[PDB]
């Protein structure tokens, strides 16, 4: 049960939800919905926020168990397409494909919480895998294309040679929030801003 | 059927639910929804309450059968990140990971009801366990990382050496509401404030 809350001003009274409130603050929250179907929602949200105000940063919060490669590349291109800077925060985890989206934010603006976990994994075989005739020649070739894109895409955002990314990707390397900055995914790890 | 109720003033008439009412009073209720998906709701609620009034305490009620380790660490970091003090109350139970969130509240403000049960258990193997290649080298290593974080995190909130926490965690130690204060999880056990 996500509770609603009421906010008011001399204009009137507005009932709203968390998440709707975060969107008003230009925060896109990428959670467990990592399906191609949700990739479309993230793209719709990025396009809406750019339309509402092209010069204001969009903050994307990432807490997700990866997802399909093809549709998370769709998000990647929208993120790079949009005029406004996109800053990213890793909460919880950014597994596999989500680690690319984390790295994809504007440099200087990739962030993580201290116990955040970033996992680099090879792209899975999914989505349109309906029965290509020579699956071992075609799906195998498509997988090499997907591995190449993930390695290339991380190299462009982490500063590591794509060959290095492959060696780590092939071994399911898991980074801590601090290791992720030394690896080039995170620019900073957030301090806990407690008043006591 | 959770009933609704009507509250009114000279302004107008408001129909509301329990839970929505608790949120207005700055209470986050963490129940049976212990999935990564709900961890995201708790984080959204903590962020909303801080935004509405950064200097007022947030009360978190805990009654839950643990949950996934990764996503409950996401809650942990948000709880420590937020400027306002977070106080916690254990109702029913705070199993495993939820016992960390219980311990995580600001010292002097961890509370429990008299028959509350606090259980300390090792982090489970869950979430992103999709098929790491060497699962026995990698998942086994990730588990040691998760055990280390739980032990370290409780030690920072209970005052016990992490080695002690491990000995108890490994044996599924169950604490009563009173034992939990002597163990360092609870600062106080609530009296029953009956008028008769």
């Amino acid at each position: 049960i996500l509770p609603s809350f009421i906010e008011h001003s001399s204009f009137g009274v507005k009932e709203s939800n968390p998440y709707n409130k975060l969107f008003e603050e230009r925060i896109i929250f990428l959670g467990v919905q990592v399906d191609d179907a949700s990739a479309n929602d993230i793209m719709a949200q990025l396009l809406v926020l750019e339309s509402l105000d092209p010069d204001r940063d969009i903050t994307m919060y990432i807490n997700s168990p990866g997802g399909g490669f093809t549709s998370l590349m769709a998000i990647y291109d929208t993120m790079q397409y949009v005029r406004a800077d996109i800053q990213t925060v890793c909460l919880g985890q950014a597994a596999s494909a989500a680690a690319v989206l984390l790295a994809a934010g504007t440099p200087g603006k990739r962030m993580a919480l201290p116990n955040a976990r970033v996992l680099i994994h090879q792209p899975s075989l999914s989505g349109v895998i309906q029965g290509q005739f020579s699956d071992l020649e075609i799906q195998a070739a498509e997988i090499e294309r997907m591995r190449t894109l993930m390695e290339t895409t991380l190299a462009r955002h982490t500063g590591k040679d794509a060959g290095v990314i492959r060696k780590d990707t092939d071994r399911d390397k898991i980074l801590t929030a601090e290791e992720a900055k030394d690896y080039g995914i995170i620019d900073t790890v957030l301090e806990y801003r407690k008043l006591s | 059927i959770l009933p609704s109720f009507i509250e009114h003033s000279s302004f107008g008439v408001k129909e509301s639910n329990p839970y929505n009412k608790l949120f207005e009073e700055r209470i986050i209720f963490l129940g049976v929804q212990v999935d990564d998906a709900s961890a995201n709701d708790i984080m959204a609620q903590l962020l909303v309450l801080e935004s509405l009034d950064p200097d007022r305490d947030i009360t978190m009620y805990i009654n839950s059968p643990g949950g996934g380790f990764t996503s409950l660490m996401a809650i942990y970091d948000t709880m420590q990140y937020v400027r306002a003090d977070i106080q916690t109350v254990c109702l029913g139970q705070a199993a495993s990971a939820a016992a960390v969130l219980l311990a995580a509240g600001t010292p002097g403000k961890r509370m429990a009801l008299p028959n509350a049960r606090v259980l300390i258990h090792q982090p489970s193997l869950s979430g992103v366990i999709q098929g790491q290649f060497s699962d026995l080298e990698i998942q086994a290593a990730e588990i040691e990382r998760m055990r280390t974080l739980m032990e370290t995190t409780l030690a920072r909130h209970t005052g016990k050496d992490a080695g002690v926490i491990r000995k108890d965690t490994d044996r599924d130690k169950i604490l009563t509401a009173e034992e939990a204060k002597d163990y360092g999880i609870i600062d106080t056990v609530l009296e029953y404030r009956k008028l008769s």
Binding site: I27, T59, Y61, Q87, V89, M111 | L47
Partner: peptide, 6 residues
Amino acid sequence: FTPXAP
């Protein structure tokens, strides 16, 4: 989460 996001 601000600053700096927002």
